[PDB]
Amino acid sequence: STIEEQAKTFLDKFNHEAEDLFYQSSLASWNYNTNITEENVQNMNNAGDKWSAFLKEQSTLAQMYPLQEIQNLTVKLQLQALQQNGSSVLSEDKSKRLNTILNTMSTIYSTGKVCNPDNPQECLLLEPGLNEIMANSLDYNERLWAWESWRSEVGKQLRPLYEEYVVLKNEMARANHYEDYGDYWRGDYEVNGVDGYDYSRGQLIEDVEHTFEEIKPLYEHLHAYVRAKLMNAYPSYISPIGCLPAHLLGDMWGRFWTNLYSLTVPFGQKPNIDVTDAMVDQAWDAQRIFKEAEKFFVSVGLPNMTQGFWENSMLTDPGNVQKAVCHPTAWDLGKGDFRILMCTKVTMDDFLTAHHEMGHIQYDMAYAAQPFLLRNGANEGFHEAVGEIMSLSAATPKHLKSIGLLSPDFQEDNETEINFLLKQALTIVGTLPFTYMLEKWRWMVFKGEIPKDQWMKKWWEMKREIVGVVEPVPHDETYCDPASLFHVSNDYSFIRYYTRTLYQFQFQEALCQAAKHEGPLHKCDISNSTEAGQKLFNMLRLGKSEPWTLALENVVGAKNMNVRPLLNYFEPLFTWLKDQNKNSFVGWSTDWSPYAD
Amino acid sequence: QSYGFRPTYGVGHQPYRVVVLSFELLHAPATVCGPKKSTNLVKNKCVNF
Ligand SMILES: *[C@@H]1O[C@H](CO)[C@@H](O)[C@H](O)[C@H]1NC(C)=O
Numbered sequence: 001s002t003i004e005e006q007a008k009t010f011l012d013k014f015n016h017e018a019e020d021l022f023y024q025s026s027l028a029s030w031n032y033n034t035n036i037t038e039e040n041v042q043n044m045n046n047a048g049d050k051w052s053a054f055l056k057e058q059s060t061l062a063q064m065y066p067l068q069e070i071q072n073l074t075v076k077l078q079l080q081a082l083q084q085n086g087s088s089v090l091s092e093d094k095s096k097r098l099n100t101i102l103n104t105m106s107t108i109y110s111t112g113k114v115c116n117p118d119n120p121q122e123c124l125l126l127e128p129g130l131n132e133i134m135a136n137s138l139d140y141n142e143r144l145w146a147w148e149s150w151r152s153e154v155g156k157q158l159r160p161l162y163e164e165y166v167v168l169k170n171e172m173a174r175a176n177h178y179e180d181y182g183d184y185w186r187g188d189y190e191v192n193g194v195d196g197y198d199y200s201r202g203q204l205i206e207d208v209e210h211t212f213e214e215i216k217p218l219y220e221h222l223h224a225y226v227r228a229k230l231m232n233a234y235p236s237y238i239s240p241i242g243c244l245p246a247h248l249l250g251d252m253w254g255r256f257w258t259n260l261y262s263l264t265v266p267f268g269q270k271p272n273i274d275v276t277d278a279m280v281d282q283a284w285d286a287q288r289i290f291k292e293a294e295k296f297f298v299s300v301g302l303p304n305m306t307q308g309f310w311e312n313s314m315l316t317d318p319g320n321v322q323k324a325v326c327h328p329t330a331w332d333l334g335k336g337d338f339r340i341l342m343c344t345k346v347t348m349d350d351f352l353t354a355h356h357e358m359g360h361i362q363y364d365m366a367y368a369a370q371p372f373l374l375r376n377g378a379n380e381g382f383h384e385a386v387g388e389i390m391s392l393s394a395a396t397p398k399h400l401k402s403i404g405l406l407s408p409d410f411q412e413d414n415e416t417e418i419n420f421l422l423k424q425a426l427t428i429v430g431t432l433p434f435t436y437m438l439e440k441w442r443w444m445v446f447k448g449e450i451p452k453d454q455w456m457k458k459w460w461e462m463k464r465e466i467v468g469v470v471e472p473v474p475h476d477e478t479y480c481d482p483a484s485l486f487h488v489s490n491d492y493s494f495i496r497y498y499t500r501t502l503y504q505f506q507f508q509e510a511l512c513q514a515a516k517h518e519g520p521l522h523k524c525d526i527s528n529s530t531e532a533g534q535k536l537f538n539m540l541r542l543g544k545s546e547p548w549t550l551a552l553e554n555v556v557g558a559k560n561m562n563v564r565p566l567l568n569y570f571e572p573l574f575t576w577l578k579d580q581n582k583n584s585f586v587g588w589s590t591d592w593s594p595y596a597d
Numbered sequence: 598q599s600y601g602f603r604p605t606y607g608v609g610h611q612p613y614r615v616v617v618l619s620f621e622l623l624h625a626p627a628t629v630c631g632p633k634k635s636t637n638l639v640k641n642k643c644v645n646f
């Protein structure tokens with residue numbers, strides 16, 4: 001009769017074929033990543049190409065289906081996701097051109113090697129050369145030279161290519177009814193078809209600006225403390241009121257400030273949270289780590305894992321006989337096949353990452369009943385949020401006390417708590433302002449308000465304002481520093497970290513309130529709290545089948561994002577920083593720069 | 598429709614063999630009867646044969 005049952009039956013067929021197709025693709029990917037051989041690469045390529053061809057076929061088939069007005073909450077969302085083809089909405093020639101330009105900056109960023117001036121034949125890639133130099137060599141001159149080399153050797157070849165990339169992305173967005181490619185990425189967060197819970201695309205900008213405005217004093221105090229500590233370390237390289245150099249942030253771009261902690265620890269003589277020797281003494285192995293993690297999720301209210309995972313997954317290093325990329329990854333292969341790759345050592349890093357991986361598998365399992373196009377999170381920042389909240393909950397020392405992973409005489413004190421909060425701030429909080437700066441710059445560039453000849457002529461001003469960092473070496477328009485990161489050069493979004501951090505803090509506060517936790521938020525554990533586990537699993541099972549705000553309210557009860565859990569969690573850090581910064585200037589000065597005296 | 602099977606599939610998808618029994622208790626001449634297993638044949642003792 002009408003188009004309702006027509007679309008229903010077409011989507012049933014699409015689900016039936018896509019389950020098997022993604023099953024084959026994921027099986028090939030798992031074979032490749034666990035076994036680095038040319039045949040495995042060819043199999044992965046064939047599987048991916050076949051899946052892309054089938055997606056093209058399904059989009060073509062669904063194109064004749066009229067938009068009309070259908071509000072089943074599944075079929076409309078599925079056809080909307082299938083319709084946004086993107087690269088294929090323009091002509092074939094323009095698609096080939098954008099593929100060429102995409103591979104252009106991809107290869108340029110991958111092979112942006114820098115060679116030492118004293119030895120032309122000695123060249124280093126981004127890994128492990130620049131990473132090791134950044135994380136180990138604390139010399140000011142070497143870090144500055146590495147920053148200069150990385151942002152000089154690569155940006156010149158990228159500037160006009162990124163110009164054409166921005167133009168083409170704007171073209172694709174405008175052809176698909178988005179004002180800019182930024183609006184295309186907003187469309188994921190767009191909420192419509194529900195009464196009383198609608199979310200506008202400008203509401204994202206409004207909420208982001210409001211949240212960053214509230215966060216600004218926290219970043220100001222943290223940056224002032226870092227400036228004071230590094231000026232104590234570097235008397236003649238940092239102004240008392242000026243902005244910190246780009247290479248004195250703990251990394252190369254400003255993404256994470258972890259390496260500053262060793263130079264900015266309040267009490268370094270006190271021990272740091274590390275129980276590697278404990279698991280070494282107890283003769284632990286990675287299978288025991290996974291068993292303990294499954295037991296912990298049983299305690300918090302999750303059912304145990306099936307035998308298929310333990311028969312199929314790999315939980316340790318397979319050696320070089322069949323090579324494997326040891327980046328810990330999860331797979332929902334389809335047809336109830338769940339797996340994880342991880343080269344597990346007896347470490348706390350591996351412990352936390354393993355909780356992320358297996359709780360991330362559990363999150364994937366939560367929406368098993370949802371159809372194929374609904375086998376995803378409500379927004380781009382829920383799976384990482386679940387992983388991070390599980391890591392934070394399992395990282396609490398009391399959680400280790402119950403299972404005997406550390407000596408009970410640790411005697412949690414104020415100094416250790418402040419050290420842990422500072423590590424969190426320089427690891428989790430330390431990325432929020434930089435992420436906001438980069439995402440705002442990308443938004444304003446895509447929207448067309450930033451002239452090309454002035455692109456960085458805006459960035460390095462706002463860097464003196466938002467991030468509070470002044471460029472150490474002047475650059476002309478040839479260089480392309482703002483686009484010298486992984487996300488921009490690999491065609492991925494960047495707001496996911498900010499959204500994930502906000503969501504993870506809200507989720508942790510909700511679980512703690514549902515767990516009858518008393519005291520500071522950082523000393524909160526969800527173990528043996530099935531109520532909070534089920535309350536969060538209510539969100540987990542929803543997936544993307546429903547708008548993200550309803551899922552958010554289902555656990556926290558708040559329809560809009562807010563930073564109140566951030567204040568509740570970091571209040572001791574706020575008080576300590578305010579007490580310490582009584583005789584130091586708060587804020588950064590835009591006029592100061594190392595290269596001008 | 599194709600009705601194949603695989604061993605990787607979990608509980609609920611592995612193939613099962615099922616058989617049925619149709620009876621009739623309507624009053625009719627009896628054909629299929631049970632032997633009521635067996636008992637040892639006692640002798641020279643008042644019993645219930
Ligand atoms: C690994 O790959 C090689 C070549 O592609 C293949 O011969 C071998 O069987 C693979 N290993 C496994 C366990 O399948």
Ligand SMILES: *[C@@H]1O[C@H](CO)[C@@H](O)[C@H](O)[C@H]1NC(C)=O
Pocket residue numbers: 008072073074
């Ligand atoms: C939406 O479609 C599904 C699939 O047929 C159906 O089970 C459900 O009842 C529909 N919802 C409404 C509100 O009709």
Ligand SMILES: *[C@@H]1O[C@H](CO)[C@@H](O)[C@H](O)[C@H]1NC(C)=O
Pocket residue numbers: 304305306307
């Ligand atoms: C999971 O728990 C159920 C409940 O008793 C049990 O029957 C099953 O054997 C458990 N599975 C594993 C792999 O331990």
Ligand SMILES: *[C@@H]1O[C@H](CO)[C@@H](O)[C@H](O)[C@H]1NC(C)=O
Pocket residue numbers: 299398399402403525527528
């Ligand atoms: C949770 O309960 C188990 C069993 O009742 C117990 O062994 C464990 O110590 C408890 N953990 C906490 C943090 O109370």
Ligand SMILES: [Cl-]
Pocket residue numbers: 253481482483484
């Ligand atoms: Cl930059």
Ligand SMILES: [Zn+2]
Pocket residue numbers: 330356357359360361383384387
């Ligand atoms: Zn994960």
